Design a binder for this molecule. Structure first.
Ligand SMILES: C[C@]12CC[C@@H]3c4ccc(O)cc4CC[C@H]3[C@@H]1CC[C@@H]2O
Ligand SMILES: C[C@]12CC[C@@H]3c4ccc(O)cc4CC[C@H]3[C@@H]1CC[C@@H]2O
Ligand SMILES: [Cl-]
Lengths: 11, 231, 224, 11
């Protein structure tokens, strides 16, 4: 999945 | 969530604002098409990272599925950069303040093929905000509307209620600025009509960036590459 | 301007263009659609002259607004015509197209989806004809920050007329403002579809397979 | 003149 999908998950 | 007052809604949005970032602009040398496109996209890429955090703080956004979050950001990201830019250029007649150390007039926009048209449109949107005396509270509402609205009719009722709440919040701000009831709906219409012009600029800016990429003018980050692709 | 909200509505209702008829391959369908679009542009030019305010603009500004808005206006018209036909676009009464015929042309089915999505949205909101003609006038006057106090004051008037309509339909103040916002947010999606449509239409001309008429070529040169 | 330009007048 997309780079963004992952980035959206960190804090 | 869906139960915030207008006052708390404004408070959250102001709270969530991203920082103004600096560019790596090097004043030792004149601009070229590549170096200027380089500065702008390096800036956009770093701004996008803060945009992701800001979006997660917009009421109702983190309630969406990850896929819908991705979709909304993919639809809205350049509109959001653009209105951010227009906001900070407001008290800078005839100039675009991309960063506090990157203040550009339209003549400098000339050094990138096809940039100055988009410059001209950005400058006109900035003047328009200045002549309406757009307030900070109104600006962060607009920016939230863009995020929630722009990808919504492109694949929902949840998003529509939050959008309705921002509308109420907008009306509330105008009411307490003392505008009459007629002026409230007239001003609400004027602000939202500008969003149509911001969508148009976004569409123009996306094609321009695509062409810069197709011509190998600058290297694009992987995030920026994937944003472009979504389009 | 001087007229009442209701006189504003009768004027727009009466200036409405008629619905036109049509007479597949990627060529035969682009033929039909661009033929229809061409014949409708002629009526739109006369409709626009009946949008109150518009005939007091220089002939330069009139040219410009039409050039900016024409596809947006065709699109909202089409969407409106298609409201009571879920899943279908009623380009003409004898040309009712489902989603899958959209696949008949490369690049189209995505524009088709955006149009069905909009139609559905109107259906949902239960958009009235009176609201429709206001939205359509707003598109004309608004879509050309491109290049006017007079224009912005006609725009206020149409906002007033919209609110007026919602007030008469018995909506609370809060509901009026919310419905007004909803309708105007849809116009930015219409602007978006028009942008996409201008590209696709351009990429057809360039191939030069379908033949576009002169009025239609001029519009598509104005977007450079 | 642009075509449009004259359709606009046309009596
Ligand atoms: C996307 C472009 C580069 C990045 C630009 C940018 C870069 C940073 C920023 O904060 C705002 C904007 C808005 C305009 C954008 C430009 C419009 C066309 C150009 O390709
Ligand atoms: C311009 C296109 C052909 C003409 C189409 C049309 C044709 C007639 C009409 O009444 C409305 C529309 C809207 C969508 C338009 C299409 C979008 C893409 C296609 O190129
Ligand atoms: Cl940084």
């Amino acid at each position: 999945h997309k780079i963004l999908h992952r980035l959206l998950q960190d804090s | 969530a869906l139960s915030l007052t207008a006052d708390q809604m404004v408070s959250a949005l102001l709270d969530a604002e991203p920082p103004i970032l600096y560019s790596e602009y090097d004043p030792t040398r004149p601009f070229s098409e590549a170096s200027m496109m380089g500065l702008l996209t390096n800036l956009a890429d770093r701004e996008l990272v803060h945009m992701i955090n800001w979006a997660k703080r917009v009421p109702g956004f983190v309630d969406l599925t990850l896929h819908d979050q991705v979709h909304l950001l993919e639809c809205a990201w350049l509109e959001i950069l653009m209105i951010g830019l227009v906001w900070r250029s407001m008290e800078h007649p005839g100039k675009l303040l991309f960063a506090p150390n990157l203040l550009l007039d339209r003549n400098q926009g000339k050094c990138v093929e096809g940039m100055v048209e988009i410059f001209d449109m950005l400058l006109a949107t900035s003047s328009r905000f200045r002549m309406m005396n757009l307030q900070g509270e109104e600006f962060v509402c607009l920016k939230s509307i863009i995020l929630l609205n722009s990808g919504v009719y492109t694949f929902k009722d949840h998003i529509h209620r939050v959008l309705d709440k921002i509308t109420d919040t907008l009306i509330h701000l105008m009411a307490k600025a003392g505008l009459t009831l007629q002026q409230q709906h007239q001003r609400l219409a004027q602000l939202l009509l500008i969003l149509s012009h911001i969508r148009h600029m976004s569409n123009k800016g996306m094609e321009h960036l695509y062409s810069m990429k197709c011509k190998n003018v600058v290297p694009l980050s992987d995030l920026l590459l994937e944003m472009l692709d979504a389009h």
